[PDB]
């Protein structure tokens, strides 16, 4: 009776963790695209402008 | 110390770069818009010429 | 600010020397050549950001069509009489839909 | 009073000497060049504050 109740609590917490790690994984794929874009914008600004020697 | 503790720290750095890069563009200024308008008008003048054909 | 005055002067003399070594034709020619090479590299950098536009269209399409296959599987599961199997398919289908929504926003 | 005077004299002789080494055409050109580099850094300083606004 203790084992069955205990098993459920472990089983439930793990599934919630899988969802969290999946979200991170989901964030990571698109988050890299933001970084690429942010870098690309910076170079365009420097090349169009640029002042002093 | 945790995997999340470093992931969430990295996310903020990517977002800061996105904000910084756009802000650099804001303060540089843009000339694209007033050139684009010249292209739109430039079309309008030759739309009439196209219409005759 | 006596130090500053000196630091200004040392740099000014170096700048004056550099502008002797600046020929007119060749520094000017090299300047266009540098710009041409740098511009091509920038086009390459931009192209891989413009790749992500196309890729995010693919990602969304895909996962919205896994969502359909869960429905396709579910219709049969209901008919055959396994309510639990049907609910699992429908539950899985929902959070694929949540994921799909997120993609459009990003896109 | 006394040391204060002598320490002014040391500064004053140096001040004259550096002003002689300041050519007006070159020093003027260099200063404008410095100011342009400084302006770019300052624009980026504002941009990184505007970043936290966003």
Swiss-Prot record, chain B:
Record's protein name: Membrane-associated protein Vipp1
Function: Required for thylakoid formation.
Subcellular localization: Cell inner membrane
Recorded superkingdom: Bacteria
Protein species of origin: Synechocystis sp. (strain ATCC 27184 / PCC 6803 / Kazusa)
The family this protein is said to belong to: Belongs to the PspA/Vipp/IM30 family.
Summary of the knockout phenotype: Essential, it cannot be completely disrupted. Cells with very low levels of protein have no ordered thylakoids, are barely green and are non-photosynthetic.
């Amino acid at each position: 009776a203790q084992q069955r109740t205990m098993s459920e609590n472990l089983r439930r917490n793990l599934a919630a963790l899988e969802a969290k790690i999946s979200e991170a994984k989901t964030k990571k794929n698109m988050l890299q695209a933001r970084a690429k874009a942010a870098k690309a914008n910076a170079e365009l600004q420097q090349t169009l402008g640029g002042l002093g020697t | 110390s945790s995997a999340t503790s470093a992931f969430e720290r990295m996310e903020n750095k990517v977002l800061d770069m996105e904000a910084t890069s756009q802000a650099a563009g804001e303060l540089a200024g843009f000339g694209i818009e007033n050139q684009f308008a010249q292209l739109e008008a430039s079309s309008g003048v030759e739309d009439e010429l196209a219409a005759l054909k | 600010a006596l130090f500053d005055r000196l630091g200004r002067v040392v740099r000014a003399n170096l700048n004056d020397l550099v502008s002797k070594a600046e020929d007119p034709e060749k520094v000017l020619e090299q300047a266009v050549i540098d710009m041409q090479e740098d511009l091509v590299q920038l086009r390459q950098a931009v192209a891989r950001t413009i790749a992500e536009e196309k890729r995010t269209e693919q990602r969304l399409n895909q996962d919205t069509q896994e969502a359909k296959k869960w429905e396709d599987r579910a219709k049969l599961a209901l008919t055959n009489g396994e309510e639990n199997l049907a609910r699992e398919a429908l539950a899985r289908k929902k959070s694929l839909t949540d994921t799909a929504a997120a993609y459009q926003t990003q896109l």
